[PDB]
Amino acid sequence: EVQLVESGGGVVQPGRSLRLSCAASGFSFSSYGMHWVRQAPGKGLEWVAVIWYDGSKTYYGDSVKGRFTISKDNSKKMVNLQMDSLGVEDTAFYYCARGIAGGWAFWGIDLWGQGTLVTVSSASTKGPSVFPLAPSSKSTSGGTAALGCLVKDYFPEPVTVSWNSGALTSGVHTFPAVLQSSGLYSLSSVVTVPSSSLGTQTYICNVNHKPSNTKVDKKVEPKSCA
């Protein structure tokens, strides 16, 4: 089974450099033109570069021309992408991919890697502050209520949220994070639940942030007002 595996991803400060690597499993490499493609959060696919089957020629996308270098080491059986003078806009998932030869260029890109996240930021690795989004902010009575967790100001790659250690999945909405003006991330995880269960059933959100190796379990209760 043919595969491509990217490595070298992670956090880099704007103005610095990062080198991405790509390793071929089960095939040639030496007879294929190899590409890099990226996808920035909320944007579409963007072609980055290509290195000829030969290693003789290179082509780059307009936004990376001058800053990036694609190369091939047939001895180490690797494809590299040297990214210099990185900016916050270079934050994306990067894929290593194989071209289908065709004519004087390519007909398509058939084999792709899993991708690797490159976060270009000067922020410091910080664990989230977990705040409750307490249920029935007015009335309870009849049926169905909403509650959740505000997972605020973290800096990583991602966070994972689960409810009641994975036992509550039904009616859960964990939202895509937003990058705030501070350079920190924030998200909400909400769950719709029967109103009758609010007094009896315990709702805990399990926030795990691997980059700062922090684990938070916040219990979400209706706000006792007096």
Binding site: H35, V37, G44, L45, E46, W47, V50, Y59, Y60, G61, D62, Y95, I100, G102, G103, A105, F106, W107, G108, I109, D110, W112, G113, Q114, G115, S129, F131, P132, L133, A134, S137, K138, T144, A146, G148, L150, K152, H173, F175, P176, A177, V178, Q180, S186, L187, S188, V190, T192, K223, C225
Partner: protein, 214 residues
Amino acid sequence: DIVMTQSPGTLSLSPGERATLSCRASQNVYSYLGWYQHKPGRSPRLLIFGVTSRATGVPDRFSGSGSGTDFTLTISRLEPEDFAVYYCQQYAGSAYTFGQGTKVEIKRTVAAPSVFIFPPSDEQLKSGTASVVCLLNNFYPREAKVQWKVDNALQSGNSQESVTEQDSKDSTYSLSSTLTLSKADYEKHKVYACEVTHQGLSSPVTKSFNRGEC
């Protein structure tokens, strides 16, 4: 240099329906055209290469046609697994540019959002900040307008929105809007409200609370 233009931006269709996606090139691309499928947390997938050729394992319901500057990807029968984002890519020029993508989504009946407002927690206020959350749960279509009003004054530049991805079981979307303020600014006002406008609402829906008052 070669601009790839895909149309439409979104295609709202039911499973079993025929989907026809367009890709236009700014100049002739002669056979140097590929079509890709992209699912939220997955790698892009080659569907068609060399305008017309089906990649390995691509079902025959997918077909590519066209020439020069005008290309089409036809999915003859939309199966539930074909609801994805589709890109075309050109290899005819210097820089192998992609189109912006066409999202193919499940058309379903109009569903109005259930709307919920959450005031900032006491834990958060103790930190010096205040976030007010407006949740719009299980609505369709995707298009919705959220407006924050603070003591009846319309807010701008201090809220951020997030949408979930069409739900596997019911084909709806959920939206979260967060109004962020300092504890200082939050304490300067009483009424916090989000007003929701959606096709499924006969009139906009407003959810409010007064600061302090539970």
